[model samples]
Target: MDNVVLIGKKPVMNYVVAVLTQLTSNDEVIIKARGKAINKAVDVAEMIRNRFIKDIKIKKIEIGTDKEVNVSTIEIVLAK
Candidate 1:
């Protein structure tokens, strides 16, 4: 199964971390954000790193478009 979690409108990295930390073995966690949200997502990622989730990695993508959406991507991956 695949799922997407939208953390915009009021993105909370701590909350995201809490939720992702609960995944069972073999399950994975991926968090993504776009546009101005890129920074917030990075903040969340730093938090995870500070917390020492070494198994997790952050990937960034920049999208330049006129669309009314964040123009960047921040992805966090957690696999257990």
Candidate 2:
């Protein structure tokens, strides 16, 4: 399955809204971020799971540094 793969430039709530919209037709949505945006991605997932869809769950979380740079990346999997 293809992950949602949200890039890390938009506001946390913007990502939250996208995640909310994505869940209706998707079994899982993956929120991704790098550098300073990792916290924002986490905020999106947590807000959606706690405030919007209580049934939604965080399926997985992966963290690593980019191969070409020092930027750290994070992928959060939210599944319904």
Candidate 3:
């Protein structure tokens, strides 16, 4: 199971903390973003793994389209 941290206009550190908090609860953490936020999502996942939890694994990365808005969405899952 996983807990999702949706990425948006908030600063990168905000989402970073969200993932860190959820990670302590034993569920996999997923950093999800849409459109322009996609890059930020990738950075957050990268920072968490590279800086804080060095033992985590990037379990999966899923990409899809939101047909209604025609925007791209991505999800990167991290597990400890």
Candidate 4:
């Protein structure tokens, strides 16, 4: 399965469901977002954790500046 999900203009719920689907058979998933999409990424993760997967673990959250686009980036790893 594709472990990495890149966030963009699509609705956050779409990715949330995608992650949930992946988790059904996989152990972990990574959500990536840059610029203004960062907040939506967090929302998706939170929604899943709060409403769907109570045992979900936030394995890691890494933040860094992207030199190419000169914007902040976030990577959130969620594990079961």
| Candidate 4 weakest ten by summed lDDT | 64-73
lDDT of each: 0.55, 0.83, 0.91, 0.91
lDDT, candidate 1, 1-80, per-residue tens: 45344446475756565536555433555656666766676566566656756565544333344334535555665443
Model 2, span 26-66: residue lDDT tens: 98998888888988888888888789999888899999988
User: What would the TM-score be for candidate 2 when compared with the true structure?
Assistant: 0.87
Give the clashing pairs for model 3.
Answer: none
Best by lDDT: 3
Q: List the candidates ranked by lDDT, beginning with the highest.
A: 3, 4, 2, 1
- Which rank order by TM-score, best down to worst? 3, 4, 2, 1
lDDT of 3 at 53: 96
TM-score of 1: 0.53
The predicted structure with the larger TM-score, 2 or 4, is 4
* Per-prediction CA RMSD (Å): 3.9, 1.8, 1.7, 1.3
lDDT of candidate 4 at residue 21, scale 0 to 100: 80
Stretches of candidate 1 exceeding 4 Å from the true structure: 1-3, 11-14, 21-27, 52-70
Off by over 4 Å in 4: none
Candidate closer to the true structure by lDDT (higher is better), 3 or 4: 3
